[PDB]
Design a protein around this ligand. Sequence first.
Ligand SMILES: CCc1c(C(=O)Nc2cc(S(=O)(=O)NC)ccc2C)[nH]c(C)c1C(C)=O
Length: 126
Amino acid sequence: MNPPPPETSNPNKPKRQTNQLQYLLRVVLKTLWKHQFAWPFQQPVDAVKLNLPDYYKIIKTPMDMGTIKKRLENNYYWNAQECIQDFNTMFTNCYIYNKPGDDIVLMAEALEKLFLQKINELPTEE
Ligand SMILES: CCc1c(C(=O)Nc2cc(S(=O)(=O)NC)ccc2C)[nH]c(C)c1C(C)=O
């Protein structure tokens, strides 16, 4: 059984739109999305389809770029730090579940290298 995906909508949660959050959607997310190694991270891990019954038993805070993209588009975040935390969770999740050799890990590392260089250039709040 797959769990419910992370929430991308919640009217109770305080929301903001900031140039940093705009940057995260416009630059950071768009670069990673169009990348060739993006496809495994573009949606939640369907552990049923992939026959990974253990995945959600070990991964307790799942996160993927589809969810992140929805959150950015639906103005879900208060600050850039929340979004950055989601991207990092996604990478860490992948390193925890998989062995260091695996293709998925090489794909995550290439994406992360890209993520970390774009985050270096996260603008000061305006
Ligand atoms: C290796 C499984 C995995 C994916 C992934 O999605 N792989 C995948 C998905 C489909 S698919 O049929 O579901 N179509 C999209 C088909 C084939 C593959 C290899 N993503 C992450 C983060 C992981 C893990 C466990 O870290």
